[PDB]
From Swiss-Prot, chain B:
Location within or outside the cell: Cytoplasm
GO biological process terms on file: L-leucine biosynthetic process
Binding site for NAD(+): 76-89, 280-292
Descriptive protein name: 3-isopropylmalate dehydrogenase
Family of this protein: Belongs to the isocitrate and isopropylmalate dehydrogenases family. LeuB type 1 subfamily.
NCBIfam families tied to this protein: leuB
Domain of life: Bacteria
Cofactor binding note: Binds 1 Mg(2+) or Mn(2+) ion per subunit.
Keywords attached to this entry: Amino-acid biosynthesis, Branched-chain amino acid biosynthesis, Cytoplasm, Leucine biosynthesis, Magnesium, Manganese, Metal-binding, NAD, Oxidoreductase
Biological pathway: Amino-acid biosynthesis; L-leucine biosynthesis; L-leucine from 3-methyl-2-oxobutanoate: step 3/4
InterPro entries documented for this protein: IsoCit/isopropylmalate_DH_CS (IPR019818), IsoPropMal-DH-like_dom (IPR024084), Isopropylmalate_DH (IPR004429)
Upper classification of the organism: Bacteria, Bacillati, Bacillota, Bacilli, Bacillales
Subunit structure comment from the entry: Homodimer.
Hydrolase among keywords: no
């Protein structure tokens, strides 16, 4: 019913696409009597310019108080001469850690008027409607030791380190997700070699008993690789570790041709999450009105669903987006069927129109 | 010239496909006085029966005295239910370990007749012609600690370990291969996070100096992932560590729609090498004259190219293969343009028939 959304526009096209999203968001909620509050906070270069830090204290306070957090994008050449800790990106990663977000969702859906842009033949990419869940916290990435020895640096090592809990929490959220979707989950691992994988597969099996309605299937990372190309239509929800997830996520991006309008979510154990578009800030297109708001809008859609259970409301936005693209409208970047180019503002106005239909 | 070759047909359709390779090989070699000395041996399940072990010491001696080793495939229902030590696969692993083969070279190229079947839109997959060189010896696959640490074993770890030499050799090999190809090497890693990758790139950069005529590029595994889909034609020779190469290899397998006629090869620091088709044993198919010999036949050509340097000879084989596929011929597994299914012996006959 009531919801306090933390809004963090950011840099570049960030604000543009955010306004577009908020508009769509507002209408949808209005149509069902929902009351929402939007507190705007700074992050990235903006925050740096106004508070010296890419992630000011006020912003954290707002986020902690909020039911969820909507983000645009951060980045720009103005801050590229600063040390890593004093750059846009840092504020983003910081915010993610402070909120304790471990799950990262990267949905990938096939849009009919976009199949011509798909690197694959229509027959395959057609029907693709999956979501990849990635472990953000642990993995081969943060695992120590990572060093050289020898002497003379003759030997080097990296460590894949996971705690039973880190694996439990993610596989749990994965199940809960597949449960509100087509109830099909694919635990991808390398259980044939990695011990961490063996632990993962065990826990997958265990958690399964708790969600008997969800079909658990086990796949080895390398097979999934081929399958994302020759049969991505089979996947509903895919759960996987950090390193493997990173890879698969990127692979799945290109398959539909919808890259550029891809949303994402970084969830945790409860109904809180940070939703933002995959695309960057693209400071070059700043102000010119070519900023593509579709990604951010679809993000707001994910928010409503995953953080508020507002399915009906979420589907509205998803349909609008689909229909408008079905009509051939885009801001210029997407290669929609029969090119009908409009501006950031218009494409938005269109989405709203379709909503009050 | 003369060339002693170990022939390990293996089991299943192994001996069927291995035949074709031998026939074709002879047809080609007898073009300019080439003494092809073949010496058959046992391995995998076959060996298990007539020797008790998946890898008979006799086979090793055979191998150790051969210029290169051709192989069919190993595996079967019969031996799959016995202990791990008496499983046919270990014979292969062992032999590879005994010969010290570290680099796994697995080529992927487009074949016009199969273009309709590719998962990628014609324009993308067309013209593809790359080779992925994967490191086999080290990495996260062979590295301890790899256990569940307490309390209550509620912690687990795996180790990615590499030695300066394991890396140096794989990269030098890669460079050398690029030099005989289009002179373009793509070193793939995760050098922004993995210290092993950081070291890998360093070494890759240093080796580049010794091969100034080869264009080196560094790509992150993940980018390389989407590139194999979006623009696979940009690659020539890709090189990377175990884990990464295992994945990428599999990814690139389907892109051209030729998985089933794809050959592989395991090499080491010298001209010696082991060549085998990527396909399994396929027991249920055994004897029915429907096994695809192309995969093994291509492996034979790779052998002539990488072990003996007989480029013109390898070229002829690959041409012959294309032409047969050009005429819409296969055994049923492939989906050629105007498809015509014939038997294994038949295709082979055509291959030879085209081979002259």
């Amino acid at each position: 019913m009531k919801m306090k959304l933390a809004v963090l526009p950011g840099d570049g096209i960030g604000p543009e696409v955010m306004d577009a999203a908020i508009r769509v968001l507002k209408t949808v909620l209005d149509n069902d009597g929902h009351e929402a509050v939007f507190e705007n906070a700074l992050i990235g270069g903006a925050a740096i310019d106004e508070a010296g830090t890419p992630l000011p204290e006020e912003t954290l306070d707002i986020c902690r108080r909020s039911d969820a957090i909507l983000l645009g994008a951060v980045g720009g050449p103005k801050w590229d001469h600063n040390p890593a800790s004093l750059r846009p990106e840092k504020g983003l990663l910081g915010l993610r850690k402070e909120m304790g977000l471990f799950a990262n969702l990267r949905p990938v859906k096939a849009y009919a008027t976009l199949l011509n842009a798909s690197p694959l033949k229509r027959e395959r990419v057609e029907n693709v409607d999956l979501v990849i869940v990635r472990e953000l916290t642990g993995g081969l990435y943060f695992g120590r030791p990572s060093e050289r020895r020898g002497p003379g640096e003759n030997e080097v090592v990296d460590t894949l380190a996971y705690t039973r809990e880190e694996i439990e929490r993610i596989i749990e959220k994965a199940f809960q997700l597949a449960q509100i979707r087509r109830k099909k989950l694919a635990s991808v691992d390398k259980a044939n070699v990695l011990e961490s994988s063996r632990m993962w597969r065990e826990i997958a099996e265990e958690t399964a008993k708790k969600y008997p309605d969800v079909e658990l299937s086990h796949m080895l990372v390398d097979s999934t690789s081929m399958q994302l190309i020759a049969n991505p239509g089979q996947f509903d929800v895919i759960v996987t570790e950090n390193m493997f997830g990173d890879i698969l996520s990127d692979e799945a991006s290109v398959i539909t041709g919808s890259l550029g309008m891809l949303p994402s979510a970084s969830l945790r154990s409860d109904r809180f999450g940070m939703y933002e578009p995959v695309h960057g800030s693209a400071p070059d297109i700043a102000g010119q009105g070519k900023a593509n708001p579709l990604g951010t809008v679809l993000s707001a859609a994910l928010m409503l669903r995953y953080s508020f259970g507002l399915e009906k409301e979420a589907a509205a936005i998803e349909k609008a987006v689909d229909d408008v693209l079905q009509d051939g409208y885009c801001t210029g970047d997407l290669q929609v069927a029969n090119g009908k180019v409009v501006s950031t503002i218009e494409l938005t106005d269109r989405l709203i129109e379709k909503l009050n239909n």
